[PDB]
């Protein structure tokens, strides 16, 4: 079942109890994410503007894709990391000679035509219905944040990296079974991106912060630490909830073999998001990169 990654020893990483019952798996080719990610920096620095040693998907020990999508097809590992950085590089713009990224798309047709064609169209619904605020109730924030984190982007990204062909009729079915998983990673990110996003709202003149922490502070009339405790409590529960879905969806043949794989692959995106966000320079400024990672950022590839 797993032939592209290994299980990381539980006594070597911190979980904070936010992914109980899930193994932490790391891609056996993590150096491919580096080159793919760093080349996105260089292409950024060469075509749109300054970009050197950017803190995004990369980590010194756990890079996002290498640990969130550990069973990614090795030959596709570089190009997925290339796209993931541009995703990270664009979310910061959210918070033009850039149309010359058709080289990314055309590269994916050289690998898999049908998988890419759906993914590119999966990103159509993402980009086009993304541009179209301020939440004080959590029940209303969950539907929004589910989109704002990038579910459609991730769907097209993983399915290509795993080579999954889900029939067009299960597309509405799939999104209604990873609700608990997507709520989990959404609250997780809102906790660890909170400092950089709270600092962000301080400059724009924002009286609000589009973050679960701020939302909970308004809805429950509590402070920062009070919201953190509530948020962490919900994550554990929603993580548990999704784990029940897995055992229930283990044996249905009307379910695609691919979709059944994709549901299982969502587990390690949860455990991966935990170990990554706890170390990544994106949320942890004081953390430095690898010798190898730097040597390619400074000296190039
Ligand atoms: N996975 C999306 C997370 C973010 O992009 P977002 O701002 O939560 O969309 P981050 O700023 O935390 O990197
Ligand atoms: Cl821990
Ligand atoms: Mg952001
Ligand atoms: Mg954002
Ligand atoms: Mg965030």
Swiss-Prot record:
Annotated Mg(2+) 2 binding sites: 91, 95
Residues annotated as binding Mg(2+) 1: 91, 95
Sequence similarity: In the N-terminal section; belongs to the terpene synthase family. In the C-terminal section; belongs to the FPP/GGPP synthase family.
Domain of life (superkingdom): Eukaryota
Region (Fusicocca-2,10(14)-diene synthase): 1-291
Oligomeric and partner information: Hexamer.
Task of the protein: Multifunctional diterpene synthase; part of the 2 gene clusters that mediate the biosynthesis of fusicoccins, diterpene glucosides that display phytohormone-like activity and function as potent activators of plasma membrane H(+)-ATPases in plants by modifying 14-3-3 proteins and cause the plant disease constriction canker.
Residue window of the full protein shown: 2 to 344 of 719
Protein name: Fusicoccadiene synthase
Organism: Phomopsis amygdali
Cystine bridges: none
């Amino acid at each position: 079942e797993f032939k592209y990654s290994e299980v990381v020893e539980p006594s070597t990483y911190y979980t904070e109890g936010l992914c109980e019952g899930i193994d932490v798996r790391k891609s056996k080719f993590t150096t491919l994410e580096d080159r793919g990610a760093i080349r996105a920096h260089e292409d950024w620095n060469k075509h749109i503007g300054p970009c050197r040693e950017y803190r995004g998907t990369l980590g010194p020990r756990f890079s996002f894709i290498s640990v969130a999508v550990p069973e990614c097809i090795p030959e596709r590992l570089e190009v997925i990391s290339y796209a993931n950085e541009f995703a990270f590089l664009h979310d910061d713009v959210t918070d033009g000679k850039k149309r010359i990224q058709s080289q990314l798309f055309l590269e994916m047709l050289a690998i898999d035509p049908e998988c890419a064609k759906t993914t590119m169209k999966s990103w159509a619904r993402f980009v086009e219905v993304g541009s179209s605020t301020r939440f004080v109730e959590l029940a209303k924030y969950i539907p929004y944040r589910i989109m704002d984190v990038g579910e459609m982007f991730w769907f097209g990204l993983v399915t290509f990296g795993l080579g999954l062909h889900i029939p067009d009729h299960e597309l509405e079915l799939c999104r209604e079974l990873m609700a608990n998983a997507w709520i989990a990673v959404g609250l997780q990110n809102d906790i660890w991106s909170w400092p950089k996003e709270r600092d962000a709202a301080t400059l724009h003149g924002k009286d609000h912060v589009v973050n679960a922490i701020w939302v909970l502070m308004q809805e429950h009339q509590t402070d920062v630490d009070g919201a953190m405790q509530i948020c962490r409590k919900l994550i554990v529960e929603y993580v548990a909830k999704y784990l029940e879905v897995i055992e229930a969806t283990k044996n249905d043949e009307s379910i695609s073999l691919d979709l059944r794989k994709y549901l299982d692959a969502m587990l390690y995106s949860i455990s991966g998001n935990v170990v990554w966000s706890l170390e990544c320079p994106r949320y942890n400024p004081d953390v430095s990169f690898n010798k190898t990672q730097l040597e390619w950022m400074r000296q190039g590839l």
